[PDB]
Every structure is written in structure tokens, then in C-alpha cells.
Design a binder for this molecule. Structure first.
Ligand SMILES: C[C@]1(c2cccc(-c3cccc(Cl)c3)c2)N=C(N)CCO1
Length: 372
């Protein structure tokens, strides 16, 4: 219960947890990222940082005498590797020694008003920078304490919770459905079917996972491979035909606004993502409402209206089930059993007619392997 409501933020700028680094403890807000594997923190002033890790003030810091360079698609950072004592004040009652990439230079990485100063990469060593030998935070936490090798995330639209070492039953209703982790690098999973308002996309299921499908709390949108994205936009446009939006909206570049409280939710269809089950050719579905894929953009200047960004976008690196997808579900990262669990959360998306759901089982006797 002491870990409930330990997250802040929103899908657009990320969800963050309070952590402490060094001795005496230096408090920092850290992005919870299941899509990366480095524990990296601002370690020098920047126009967008409220505070930063001051290594000279930590008597427990150890320099590893090794640099790290991390380029992304839209931004990059450089830093120095070292180790220090780390704790999560509203997490497990433990202090561990962990690798820390002290960010000393960055370009288009830190975000103004995000309220976070670093990233907690929760994925596996395989995708760690500079390489797989840099132990990730969670692996250290498990090795040094008696914490079970599992964490869960309950992301909530409008904070949320990160529960480490167990499953909190008060954070979900109904059944918990498991999908296998296909490979331990990202949290890679397999999507076996996609429907938009009950209509199957009918593609070869390998297309849904071209070149991988991941569960990523560090990506805002639902990101889809080109072929799947184009089919999804066609289907959503067809259901929403009573209203015509610019291509800029569908490209995720421009806002669609309606007078406060009048958003026509009913014109937008539900999206069903069928995930591979734990038994051959059995699956379960997670249903995504427009309250998830239409991301609200808060702005006092536009506040006579409710404005949204289309939170589905094209990817050339496979499917990404981002924060907009995770919101309203209780997501169990069961590393011990190499599986990811989904259940409807206490903060699930619903209106008078429709509700986000986790349903199963579904059977498909006529099925190939959906992995690439
Ligand atoms: C490391 C990062 C990353 C880096 C910097 C910022 C974010 C970020 C920014 C806004 C919202 C969110 Cl959820 C994450 C993510 N994490 C990912 N999972 C994909 C992109 O690369």
C-alpha cells in the first residue's frame, strides 16, 4: 500500500518516480522506462533541469572511468559511468549500489516542464549502452535484496503506481491475462490479431510484429509498422466519417479541438489488440478506447475547448505499445516467469456505452507463428 500513487506525470511527457542517489541522498524525479536499460541522470546544469546529480557531493560515488554516448532518433546525450547508492523512497525499503550514467552533455533530450531529471531503464542488459555488460538497475536490485524478480505498472490518465516485487490485487479487477516475453531485450511480445470496431484487419499476423512488438512505458503513442498504421488510419477515418480532419491530425502533428465537454467519443472506434497467450493458439484481447488514443493536450490558452493529438503513429522499428495503451491497465512485468500480465485497472477508461477490457480466451486453430 506504501507504494500506491508513487508515480506522477502523463503519457505525453512521461511518468516518473522519486529516487535518491548518493550519500547523503540527492532526491531526483526519474522517468519509468520499460523501453530502455540504462539508469541515466542529469549530472550538470541545463536550461530544462530543476536539479541534477552532484557527484562531488556524494561520498559513496565511484567513477568507472568509462564514457557513454547515447544517440536516439530525436536527441542524444553523453556521459560518464560510475556507481553509487540508490533508493526509491516510495518503493521497496532497500538501498542498493547501482550503475549510474552521469549525463554531462545533451541535445533535445530533457523536456521543459516534464519535471523529471533522469531515466530508469527497466528493460534487459541486451539493450544497455555501451553494451550488455553494464548491469541494469533492476538486475542489481534483485541481486542485492530479497525483492522478487517482478514489477507492475498502473499508469493513470486524467499519476499512477509502480509496485516492485509483487502484484497488488487492489490495483485491478477481473482476471490477469499473460502474454509470453518472446526475447529478453526490450519487453518483446506477439500480437496475433488486430480489430478496429470488431472488424479484423485480416493481414498476415507477422505484419503486426514487423520487426518486433514491445511494451514501452517510455513511448507515448501506440506506434505501428507502416502497413498496419495505414490500415488502422483507413478504418478509424471510415468510422469517424461524419467529421473530416486535416491530414496533419492523422500525422499526429496537429490538434483537433472541440468545445469543452463535447468530444464526440462515439464516432471513434475501439481497437482490439490480441496478444499471444501462454498456451498454443490461445490469445486474449485488450480493448483500447478513443479516450486512450486521442491524447488530451492541456493548455490554458485553448482551455475553452478540449484539444487532442492523435496518439497512433507510424514506426519503422516495429510495434510499440506505449503509455497511451498501458493507461487504464495494470501491467505486470513478470521477469521471473518471462511473461507480461494485463488486467483492467482501477483507473480504466470508460464512458456510458464502452469500457476498456481484457478478455479471453480466444482460439485460432488455423494459425502460423506471428513472430518475425
Ligand atoms: C530513452 C527513451 C526516451 C528518451 C527521452 C525521453 C523519453 C520520453 C519523452 C516523453 C514521453 C515519454 Cl513516455 C518518454 C523517452 N525511452 C524510450 N522508451 C523510447 C525513446 O527513448
Amino acid at each position: 500500500v506504501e507504494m500506491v500513487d508513487n508515480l506522477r506525470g502523463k503519457s505525453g511527457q512521461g511518468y516518473y518516480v522519486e529516487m535518491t542517489v548518493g550519500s547523503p541522498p540527492q532526491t531526483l524525479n526519474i522517468l519509468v522506462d520499460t523501453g530502455s536499460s540504462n539508469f541515466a541522470v542529469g549530472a550538470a546544469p541545463h536550461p530544462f533541469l530543476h536539479r541534477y546529480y552532484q557527484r562531488q557531493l556524494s561520498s559513496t560515488y565511484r567513477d568507472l572511468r568509462k564514457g557513454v554516448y547515447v544517440p536516439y532518433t530525436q536527441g542524444k546525450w553523453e556521459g560518464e559511468l560510475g556507481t553509487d547508492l540508490v533508493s526509491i523512497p516510495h518503493g521497496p525499503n532497500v538501498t542498493v549500489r547501482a550503475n549510474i550514467a552521469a549525463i554531462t552533455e545533451s541535445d533535445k533530450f530533457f523536456i521543459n516542464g516534464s519535471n523529471w531529471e533522469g531515466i530508469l531503464g527497466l528493460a534487459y542488459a541486451e539493450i544497455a549502452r555501451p553494451d550488455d555488460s553494464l548491469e541494469p538497475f533492476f538486475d542489481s536490485l534483485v541481486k542485492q535484496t530479497h525483492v522478487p524478480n517482478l514489477f507492475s505498472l498502473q499508469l493513470c490518465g486524467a499519476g499512477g503506481s509502480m509496485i516492485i516485487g509483487g502484484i497488488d490485487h487492489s490495483l485491478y479487477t477481473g482476471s490477469l491475462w499473460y502474454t509470453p516475453i518472446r526475447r529478453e531485450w526490450y519487453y518483446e511480445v506477439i500480437i496475433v490479431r488486430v480489430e478496429i470496431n470488431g472488424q479484423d484487419l485480416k493481414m498476415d499476423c507477422k505484419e503486426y510484429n514487423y520487426d518486433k512488438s514491445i511494451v514501452d512505458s517510455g513511448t507515448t503513442n501506440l506506434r505501428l509498422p507502416k502497413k498496419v498504421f495505414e490500415a488502422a488510419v483507413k478504418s478509424i477515418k471510415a468510422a469517424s466519417s461524419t467529421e473530416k480532419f486535416p491530414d496533419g491530425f492523422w500525422l499526429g502533428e496537429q490538434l483537433v479541438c472541440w468545445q469543452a465537454g463535447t468530444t464526440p467519443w462515439n464516432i471513434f472506434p475501439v481497437i482490439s489488440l490480441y496478444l499471444m497467450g501462454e498456451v498454443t493458439n490461445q490469445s486474449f484481447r485488450i480493448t483500447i478506447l478513443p479516450q486512450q488514443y486521442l491524447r488530451p493536450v492541456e493548455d490554458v490558452a485553448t482551455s475553452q475547448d478540449d484539444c487532442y493529438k492523435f496518439a497512433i503513429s507510424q514506426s519503422s522499428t516495429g510495434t510499440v505499445m506505449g503509455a497511451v495503451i498501458m493507461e487504464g491497465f495494470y501491467v505486470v512485468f513478470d521477469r521471473a516467469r518471462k511473461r507480461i500480465g494485463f488486467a483492467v485497472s482501477a483507473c480504466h477508461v470508460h464512458d456510458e456505452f464502452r469500457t476498456a477490457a481484457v478478455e479471453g480466451p480466444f482460439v485460432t486453430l488455423d494459425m502460423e507463428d506471428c513472430g518475425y
